[PDB]
UniProtKB/Swiss-Prot annotation, chain A:
(Microbial infection) Deamidated at Gln-73 by Photorhabdus asymbiotica toxin PAU_02230, blocking GTP hydrolysis of heterotrimeric GNAQ or GNA11 and G-alphai (GNAI1, GNAI2 or GNAI3) proteins, thereby activating RhoA. The keyword Mitochondrion does not apply. GTP binds at residues 39-44, 69-73, 138-141, 195. Residues 134-141 are annotated as: G4 motif. It is found in: Nucleus; Cytoplasm; Cell membrane; Cytoplasm, Cytoskeleton, Microtubule organizing center, Centrosome. The gene is GNAI1. This is Guanine nucleotide-binding protein G(i) subunit alpha-1. PROSITE patterns: G_ALPHA (PS51882). It comes from the Eukaryota. Mg(2+) binds at N43.
UniProtKB/Swiss-Prot annotation, chain B:
The chain crosses the membrane at residues 1-24, 37-57. The chain holds residues 585 to 649 of 908 of the full protein. Belongs to the G-protein coupled receptor 3 family. This is Metabotropic glutamate receptor 8. Coiled coil: none annotated. G-protein coupled receptor for glutamate. Ligand binding causes a conformation change that triggers signaling via guanine nucleotide-binding proteins (G proteins) and modulates the activity of down-stream effectors, such as adenylate cyclase. Signaling inhibits adenylate cyclase activity. Residues 58-63 are extracellular. Residues 25-36 are cytoplasmic. Interacts with PICK1. It is found in: Cell membrane.
Length: 223, 65
């Protein structure tokens, strides 16, 4: 082996060392996929987490998150959805103050029905069979102020319940957690977000920590 | 005689625990208990009554060892 070849092997070993260090660094970060409707309050939640694709790094209690967002990607989701098979969790927003509205100029489509359809598609996808979901049900104050004048019968014909923030919110929540047909592999963490909530980072921290511990226990065959 | 029947009952109980854990291998309670180490710990429990039988035996060159 010539001296030049020895120099080449030296350089290759340096490159391998650098790549190993970078991979070990990248393996310890939480990767989140932020999904939701355009007007579902994604921007406010993004703002209160951090104190084509848009990336937002943020740290909480000595742990790191990257939090990818794909809202501005108007194309077929089946083509690029498999790029997110190995993410830690999926965050999904609903915007409860949408049960008496219409979208996409269809003029016969409840916004919340479209949200349920999207949730059903994402939850029962082939690439996401063991990925937990954090469901934020936000704009609850508008729901509280609105529920008096308009009942839930516009969005749900069968309600058999009272018009109060105590029972309608729970009714909407039990609708979304009943579309999950994989109850023995994943779970849904539901939280009610609002303006100046300031307590959503900790909820995400708790959910992701539980997810990590459960994954590690399942790998050991200990769960 | 008294240690002998005490040890025999200990052996029977340990055997019952081992058999039930083998028959219920995949249940959550059994899997949460560290099966592969549970069997080692149960072997450790099983050895002691055999130790009783060894100490009651007649001293020899093999039995001292």
């Amino acid at each position: 082996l010539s001296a030049e070849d020895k120099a080449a092997v030296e350089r290759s070993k340096m490159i391998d060392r650098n790549l190993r260090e970078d991979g070990e660094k990248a393996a310890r970060e939480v990767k989140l996929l932020l999904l939701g409707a355009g007007e579902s309050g994604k921007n406010t939640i993004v703002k209160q987490m951090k104190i084509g694709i848009v990336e937002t790094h943020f740290t909480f209690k000595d742990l790191h998150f990257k939090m990818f967002d794909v809202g501005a990607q108007r194309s077929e989701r089946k083509k690029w959805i498999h790029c997110f098979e190995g993410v830690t969790a999926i965050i999904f927003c609903v915007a409860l103050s949408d049960y008496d509205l219409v979208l996409a100029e269809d003029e016969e489509m409840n916004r919340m029905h479209a949200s349920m359809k999207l949730f059903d598609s994402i939850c029962n996808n082939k690439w996401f069979t063991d990925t937990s979901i954090i469901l934020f049900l936000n704009k609850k104050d508008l729901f509280e102020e609105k529920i008096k004048k308009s009942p839930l019968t516009i969005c749900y014909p069968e309600y058999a319940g009272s018009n109060t923030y105590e029972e309608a919110a729970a009714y909407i929540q039990c609708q979304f957690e009943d579309l999950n047909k994989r109850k023995d592999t994943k779970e849904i963490y539901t939280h009610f977000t609002c303006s100046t909530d300031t307590k959503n980072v900790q909820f995400v921290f708790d959910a992701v920590t539980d997810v990590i511990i459960k994954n590690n226990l399942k790998d050991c065959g200990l769960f | 005689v008294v240690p002998v029947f005490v040890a025999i009952l200990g052996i029977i109980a340990t055997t019952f625990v081992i058999v039930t854990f083998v028959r219920y291998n995949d249940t959550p309670i059994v899997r949460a208990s560290g099966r592969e180490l549970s069997y080692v710990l149960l072997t450790g429990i099983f050895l002691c009554y055999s130790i009783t039988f060894l100490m009651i035996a007649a001293p020899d060159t093999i039995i001292c060892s």
